């Protein structure tokens, strides 16, 4: 219940690396119903922000595509 409060901040990457590791440590220990509620929360927030990304959109330079596709080799 308290652990559920950290889901939204966690999903926004709005926790420190220290606290993130404490949260992971805590949902790792939590019972299955508690951990699922947390992860469902986290997921729902990530999806929302993935939709929200349409607002901050911006076109990258063509040269970046070249280097990105080439880095696979």
């Amino acid at each position: 219940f308290e652990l559920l409060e950290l889901a939204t901040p966690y999903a926004l990457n709005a926790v420190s690396d220290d606290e993130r590791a404490d949260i992971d440590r805590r949902v790792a220990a939590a019972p299955s119903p508690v951990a699922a509620a947390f992860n469902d929360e986290v997921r729902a927030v990530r999806e929302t922000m993935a939709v929200v990304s349409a607002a901050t959109t911006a076109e990258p330079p063509a040269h970046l595509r070249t280097a990105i596709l080439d880095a696979t080799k």
Partner: protein, 148 residues
């Protein structure tokens, strides 16, 4: 289908090119927004798609969308950078962000775009941790609802 594209990038595929082409403006735009530097935004975007390529086998569509998986890792990388150191969908989202209350818009502005932790937001706004956590939750609930 974006989930199916990401499913095909782990070993190699020409779908990485298609996965990149369909998502690049949203990833680059987010990174630009957070870092506000063309040079480092380009380099960060490369790092992001290198991680896509390498860790694509970790992707599980039954845990979340490919889009969310990509943007979440992109945001994590951009925010880390700050701490350690078509148009219809655009305007649809902007209306929902504008429909949030001032406090609820401010929470997302500082935490998400500004890269502040919820603790750092509580200190800056002279509020309790309980209050900022509830407020971040409220802001995201209103967005989830408005966008549905």
């Amino acid at each position: 289908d974006l989930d199916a594209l990401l499913r095909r990038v782990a070993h190699d595929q020409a779908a990485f090119a298609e996965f990149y082409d369909h998502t690049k403006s949203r990833v680059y735009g987010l990174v630009m927004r957070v870092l506000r530097d063309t040079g480092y935004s380009e380099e960060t975007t490369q790092e992001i798609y290198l991680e896509v390529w390498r860790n694509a086998s970790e992707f599980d569509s039954a845990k979340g969308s490919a889009l969310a998986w990509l943007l979440t890792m992109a945001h994590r990388r951009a925010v880390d950078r700050v701490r350690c150191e078509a148009g219809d969908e655009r305007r649809r989202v902007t209306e929902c962000l504008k429909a949030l209350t001032d406090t609820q818009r401010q929470c997302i502005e500082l935490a998400y775009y500004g890269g502040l932790t919820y603790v750092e937001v509580s200190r800056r706004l002279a509020a309790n941790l309980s209050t900022i956590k509830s407020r971040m939750r409220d802001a995201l609930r209103s967005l989830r609802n408005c966008l549905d």
